[PDB]
Coordinates of C-alpha atoms in Angstrom, one line a residue:
X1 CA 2.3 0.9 16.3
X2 CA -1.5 -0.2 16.8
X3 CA -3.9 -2.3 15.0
X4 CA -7.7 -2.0 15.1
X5 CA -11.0 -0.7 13.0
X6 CA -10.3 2.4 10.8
X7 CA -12.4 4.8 8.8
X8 CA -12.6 5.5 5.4
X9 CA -9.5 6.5 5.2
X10 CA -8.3 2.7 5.9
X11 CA -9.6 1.3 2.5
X12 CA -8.0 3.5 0.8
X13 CA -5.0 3.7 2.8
X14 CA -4.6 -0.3 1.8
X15 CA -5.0 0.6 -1.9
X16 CA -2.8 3.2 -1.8
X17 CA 0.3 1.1 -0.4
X18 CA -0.9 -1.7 -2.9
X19 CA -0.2 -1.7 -6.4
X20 CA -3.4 0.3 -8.0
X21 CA -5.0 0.7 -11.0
X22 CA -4.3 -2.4 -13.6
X23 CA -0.5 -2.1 -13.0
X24 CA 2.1 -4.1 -14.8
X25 CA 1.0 -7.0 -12.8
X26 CA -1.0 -8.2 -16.2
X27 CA 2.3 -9.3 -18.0
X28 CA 3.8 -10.6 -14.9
X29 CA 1.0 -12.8 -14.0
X30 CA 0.7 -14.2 -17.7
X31 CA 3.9 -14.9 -17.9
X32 CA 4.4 -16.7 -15.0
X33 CA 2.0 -19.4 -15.9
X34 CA 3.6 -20.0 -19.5
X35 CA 7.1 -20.2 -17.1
X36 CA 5.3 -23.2 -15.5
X37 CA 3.9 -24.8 -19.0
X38 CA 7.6 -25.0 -19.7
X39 CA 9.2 -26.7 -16.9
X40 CA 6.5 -29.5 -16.5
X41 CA 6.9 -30.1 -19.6
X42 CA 10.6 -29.9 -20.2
X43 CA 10.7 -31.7 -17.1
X44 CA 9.2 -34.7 -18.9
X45 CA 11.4 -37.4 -20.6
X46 CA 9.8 -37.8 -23.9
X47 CA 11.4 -39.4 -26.9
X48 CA 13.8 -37.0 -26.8
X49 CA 14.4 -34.4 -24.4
X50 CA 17.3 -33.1 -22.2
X51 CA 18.2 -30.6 -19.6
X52 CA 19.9 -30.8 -16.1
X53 CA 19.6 -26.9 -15.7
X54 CA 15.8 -27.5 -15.3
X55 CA 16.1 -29.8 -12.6
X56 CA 18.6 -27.7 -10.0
X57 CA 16.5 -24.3 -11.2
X58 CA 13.3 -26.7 -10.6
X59 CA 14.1 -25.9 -7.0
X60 CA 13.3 -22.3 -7.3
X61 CA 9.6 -23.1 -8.3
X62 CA 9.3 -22.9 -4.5
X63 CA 7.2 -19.9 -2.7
X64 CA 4.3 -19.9 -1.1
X65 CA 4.0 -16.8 1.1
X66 CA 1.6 -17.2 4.1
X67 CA -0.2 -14.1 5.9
X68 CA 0.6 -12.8 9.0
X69 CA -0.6 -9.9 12.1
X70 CA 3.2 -7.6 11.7
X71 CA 4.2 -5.2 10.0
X72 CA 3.2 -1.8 9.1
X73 CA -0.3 0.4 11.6
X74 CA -2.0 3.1 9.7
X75 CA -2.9 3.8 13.3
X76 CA 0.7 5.6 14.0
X77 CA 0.2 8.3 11.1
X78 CA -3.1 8.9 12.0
X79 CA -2.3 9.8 15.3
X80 CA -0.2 12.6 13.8
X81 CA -2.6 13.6 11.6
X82 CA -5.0 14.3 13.8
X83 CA -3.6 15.7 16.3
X84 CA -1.8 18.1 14.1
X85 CA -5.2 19.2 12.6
X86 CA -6.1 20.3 16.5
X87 CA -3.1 21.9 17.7
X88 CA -3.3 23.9 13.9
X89 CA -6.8 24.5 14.3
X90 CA -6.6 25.5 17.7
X91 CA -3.8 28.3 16.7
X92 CA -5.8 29.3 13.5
X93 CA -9.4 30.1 16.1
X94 CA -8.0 31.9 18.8
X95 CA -6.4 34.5 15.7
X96 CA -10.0 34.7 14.3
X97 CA -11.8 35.1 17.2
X98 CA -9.3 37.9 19.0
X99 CA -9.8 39.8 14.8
X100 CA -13.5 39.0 14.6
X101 CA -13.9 41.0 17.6
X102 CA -10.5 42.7 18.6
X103 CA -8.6 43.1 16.2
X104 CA -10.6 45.1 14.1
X105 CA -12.7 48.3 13.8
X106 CA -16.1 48.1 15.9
X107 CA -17.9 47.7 12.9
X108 CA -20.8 50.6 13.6
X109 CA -23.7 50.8 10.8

C-alpha cells in the first residue's frame, strides 16, 4: 500500500516479478505474428478460399491492454523488511554488548 522512489532493490524487485532471463516468451511472440499472417490472409476472398470460422474467431484478434497506477507497492514488504532487520538487530546488540562486557570473564592479560 504505497507508491513512490525506491532503491536498488526496486529494479530488481520489477525483474523479479517479470518474466526474466530469455523465457519462453521467444516462441510465443513468433508465433503469434505467423497467427496474424494466417488470418489476413485467409480472411481474403481469392479465387478460391472459404471459412466462416475465421470470421466469428476474427473477433478474438481483439486486445490491447493499456497501463495503469493499481495494483501491487513494493513499499508494503519493505516496510517489513526493514523494520524486522531493527527490531532483530536491536535483540542481537543488547546480547553482545551485556557478553562483550558481562557476560564473560574480565579478560586480565
Amino acid at each position: 500500500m504505497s507508491d513512490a522512489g525506491r532503491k536498488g532493490f526496486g529494479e530488481k524487485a520489477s525483474e523479479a516479478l517479470k518474466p526474466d532471463s530469455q523465457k519462453s516468451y521467444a516462441e510465443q511472440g513468433k508465433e503469434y505474428i505467423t497467427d496474424k499472417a494466417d488470418k489476413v490472409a485467409g480472411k481474403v476472398q481469392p479465387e478460391d478460399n472459404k471459412g466462416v470460422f475465421q470470421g466469428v474467431h476474427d473477433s478474438a484478434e481483439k486486445g490491447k491492454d493499456n497501463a495503469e497506477g493499481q495494483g501491487e507497492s513494493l513499499a508494503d514488504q519493505a516496510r517489513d523488511y526493514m523494520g524486522a532487520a531493527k527490531s532483530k538487530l536491536n535483540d542481537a546488540v543488547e546480547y553482545v554488548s551485556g557478553r562483550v562486557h558481562g557476560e564473560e570473564d574480565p579478560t586480565k592479560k
